[PDB]
Structure formats: C-alpha cells, structure tokens
C-alpha cells in the first residue's frame, strides 16, 4: 500500500503475463503468418513431375 509496488506490482505482473501470452498467441496463430514449419513428420510428400 505505501509503496507503489506492493499490490500494483502483482497487478502489473498478472496483466503483463496475460496480455503478453494472449497477443503472442494471436499473432502467431490466428492472423495467418506461417512459421514455415519443419516438414519432417507432419506433411506427406506429394508426387512432383
């Protein structure tokens, strides 16, 4: 209470953690940037000419 970091410190901790993980998951997954995943194990090789 007397210093700024006693309870507002935990508040900024929780807000930053939630804000960070939510926005990073949003930008990594739901937008549509491709990470160019490692093609081992996940894709079967279609035949090329």
């Amino acid at each position: 209470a007397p210093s700024f970091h006693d309870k507002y410190g935990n508040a900024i901790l929780a807000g930053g953690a939630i804000f960070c993980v939510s926005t990073w998951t949003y930008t990594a997954t739901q937008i549509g940037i491709e990470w160019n995943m490692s093609p081992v194990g996940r894709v079967t090789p279609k035949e090329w000419r």
Partner: protein
C-alpha cells in the same frame, strides 16, 4: 551551491558510518535526548535508544537490505510493452505485408519436400536422414 561540495549523508553496507548525521536540525527534545546520552549509560531506555538511532541514521541495515517488488514491476512493464509490440506486429501483418509468394502453398511445399528428398538433401543427419526411403514414411 554548497550541497555537492559539502559531505552528504548516505546509507550503504559499503560505507556504514557517514560523516554527517541523518538529521541536521536539533529540537529541544533531541537536545534533552543528547543530554541523557551524556548521562548514565544504564539509565536510557528503549524508545530513547530507537529515536537516537533514528536521528543519527535514516535507514537501518535490516530495512535497507530488503527485497522490494520493483523487479516484478519491471518484468510486468516489460511484458506490457512487448504486448504492445505484438499489437504493432498485428498491424504490420495487416497493412504493409501483401501477398506471399506461391511457392509456399501446401501442395507446392509437399512437392518441394518430395523433390529435395529425391535429391537426398544433406542426408547424413540434417533433413533426408529422418525419412524412410523404403517404407515411404518418416522416422
């Protein structure tokens, strides 16, 4: 003016005893306190002792070596502004970046994988070593 030139009060474990006291003004109560300090050493009690320590030194060792929550304020602020950076990245994909080259299509990626498996690209441990060439699957 003269504050930088004069010796100044400070508190650290490096320099435990500063040249100047914590307080400079002396009240009548503090003058009487110094009189009883000059008086008998077994006749001064707990609250006079603690106020003498308070007027000589500002912060005690146990209350200045404490672990306070500024560090978690730092890491929270850092996560906040990295989240704002992620917002800038959302904008930076939504606006400046246009179409992507067609070589990244799923069928094109699969045929590229088949081609560089037929070439046996770096097949000792890198990429083609994890593909079974007889069973037509991976490892």
């Amino acid at each position: 003016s003269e504050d930088y030139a004069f010796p100044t009060y400070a508190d650290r474990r490096d320099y435990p005893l500063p040249d100047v006291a914590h307080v400079t003004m002396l009240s009548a109560s503090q003058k009487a306190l110094k009189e009883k300090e000059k008086a008998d050493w077994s006749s001064l009690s707990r609250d006079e002792k603690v106020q003498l320590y308070r007027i000589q030194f500002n912060e005690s060792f146990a209350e200045m070596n404490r672990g306070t929550n500024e560090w978690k304020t730092v890491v929270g602020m850092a996560m906040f502004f990295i989240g704002f950076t992620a917002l800038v990245l959302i904008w930076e994909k939504s606006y400046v970046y246009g179409p992507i080259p067609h070589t990244f299509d799923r069928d094109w990626v699969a045929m590229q994988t088949k081609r560089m498996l037929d070439m046996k690209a770096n097949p000792i441990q890198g990429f083609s070593a994890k593909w079974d060439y007889d069973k037509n699957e991976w490892k």
